From a paper:
Type IV pili (T4Ps) are abundant in many bacterial and archaeal species, where they play important roles in both surface sensing and twitching motility, with implications for adhesion, biofilm formation and pathogenicity. As [name] T4Ps mediate surface sensing, the first step of biofilm formation, they play a key role in allowing [name] to transition from a unicellular planktonic to a multicellular biofilm state. PilA subunits constituting the T4P exhibit a classical [name] fold featuring an extended N-terminal α-helix linked to a C-terminal globular β-sheet-containing domain, which are packed tightly along the pilus, in line with models derived from previous cryo-EM data of the [name] PAK strain.
In this study, we describe a 3.2 Å-resolution cryo-EM structure of the fully assembled [name] T4P from the model [name] strain, the highest-resolution structure of a [name] T4P using cryo-EM to date. The innermost part of the T4P is stabilised by hydrophobic interactions of the N-terminal α-helices of PilA, which contain a row of hydrophobic residues (amino acid residues 1–16, where residue 1 is the N-terminus of the mature [name]), forming the core of the T4P in a staggered arrangement. These N-terminal helices in turn interact with the helices of the globular domain through further hydrophobic interactions. For example, the Q23 and Q25 residues of every [name] subunit N interact with the β3-β4-loop of subunit N-4 and the αβ-loop of subunit N-3. [name] [name], however, is a strain that encodes a Group 2 [name] that is not glycosylated, in good agreement with our cryo-EM density which did not show any densities that are not accounted for by the polypeptide chain itself.
Numbering used by the authors:
A (entry chain A), B (entry chain D): 7 to 78
The structure:
């Protein structure tokens, strides 16, 4: 092992560092907003259809309970 | 101290020298190229995403300034 060998390794370590890391939280925030909008968008169909069929607005709830003829 | 002692030391000094040093600037240049490419590669995502969302190309700049809805 020579000192030139180790100094070249140190220089290449420094060069391999310093790689600029761009902003990434904006991408995550935008994806979260898109996911939320895509999650709550189909619920417009449920509310509108239930209101069209006469189901009371107070009877339109959120859950996995089996919807009856009066509750959705 | 004997002259044979010192001559053996001189011979071993000469032998410990003469160690061939291979080329090393090629490694540094290749690492620098890889580091530069890895630095500017993620900027493709930023430009493409900003163009997809309608941000004007002239509004896509480089810096740590907080990107607004119109500038990136």
């Amino acid at each position: 092992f020579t000192l030139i060998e180790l100094m070249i390794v140190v220089a290449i370590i420094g060069i391999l560092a310093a790689i600029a890391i761009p902003q990434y939280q904006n991408y995550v925030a935008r994806s979260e907003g898109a996911s939320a909008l895509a999650t709550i968008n189909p619920l417009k169909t449920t509310v509108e259809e239930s209101l069209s069929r006469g189901i009371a607005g107070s009877k339109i709830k959120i859950g996995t309970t089996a919807s009856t003829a009066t509750e959705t």
